[PDB]
Amino acid sequence: DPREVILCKDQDGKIGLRLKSIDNGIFVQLVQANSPASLVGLRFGDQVLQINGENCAGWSSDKAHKVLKQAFGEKITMTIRDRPFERTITMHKDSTGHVGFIFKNGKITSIVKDSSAARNGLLTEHNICEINGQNVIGLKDSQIADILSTSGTVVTITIMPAF
């Protein structure tokens, strides 16, 4: 179900968010570190249904940002549907320690033949959101590799189609 968040804007009217229009909805694209948006649990991929009670349907991202900037007062309310495109896939490292995918810039690009990723039907053109509860949005590929290397046999990832 959708949830309500309440945030206070800084002096510049900002809450630490960038938004994106996808399929006539509005989605969270960037959440700034230690911002009001971060504190209330907004994440890349969350859908914004309303801002201060007004429907976001069909708005451009420019419009959504303008609505936030012009909002009266300190507090902004948003109604949020949590990452509607998120899926979870659990894989097991093989005898060589590989789960079986190639990624670039946090996005899965190839599935290794007959790997655990293959068996589990992992898809390409999907962004990796978390690996074993560790958010990897924003992190460098070398950091994502390190998390994968350090992981135990069982590797659970949350992914979303790159839209």
UniProtKB/Swiss-Prot annotation:
GO cellular component terms given for this protein: adherens junction; azurophil granule lumen; blood microparticle; cytoplasm; cytoskeleton; cytosol; endoplasmic reticulum membrane; extracellular exosome
Residue ranges spanning the membrane: these are none
Q: Report the GO molecular function annotations.
A: cytoskeletal anchor activity; frizzled binding; identical protein binding; interleukin-5 receptor binding; phosphatidylinositol-4,5-bisphosphate binding; protein heterodimerization activity; protein sequestering activity; syndecan binding
Q: Does the keyword tRNA processing apply?
A: no
Quote the PTM field.
Phosphorylated on tyrosine residues.
Please list the residue ranges annotated as the PDZ domain. 4-83, 88-163
Q: Which GO terms describe its biological process?
A: actin cytoskeleton organization; chemical synaptic transmission; intracellular signal transduction; negative regulation of receptor internalization; negative regulation of transcription by RNA polymerase II; positive regulation of cell growth; positive regulation of cell migration; positive regulation of cell population proliferation
Tissue specificity annotation: Expressed in lung cancers, including adenocarcinoma, squamous cell carcinoma and small-cell carcinoma (at protein level). Widely expressed. Expressed in fetal kidney, liver, lung and brain. In adult highest expression in heart and placenta.
Please provide the record's keywords in A-Z order: Acetylation, Cell junction, Cell membrane, Cytoplasm, Cytoskeleton, Endoplasmic reticulum, Lipid-binding, Membrane, Nucleus, Phosphoprotein, Repeat, Secreted
Protein task: Multifunctional adapter protein involved in diverse array of functions including trafficking of transmembrane proteins, neuro and immunomodulation, exosome biogenesis, and tumorigenesis. Positively regulates TGFB1-mediated SMAD2/3 activation and TGFB1-induced epithelial-to-mesenchymal transition (EMT) and cell migration in various cell types. May increase TGFB1 signaling by enhancing cell-surface expression of TGFR1 by preventing the interaction between TGFR1 and CAV1 and subsequent CAV1-dependent internalization and degradation of TGFR1.
In Swiss-Prot or TrEMBL terms, this protein is called Syntenin-1
Q: Which organism is it from?
A: Homo sapiens (Human)
Give the stretch of the parent protein shown, with its full length.
Answer: 113 to 273 of 298
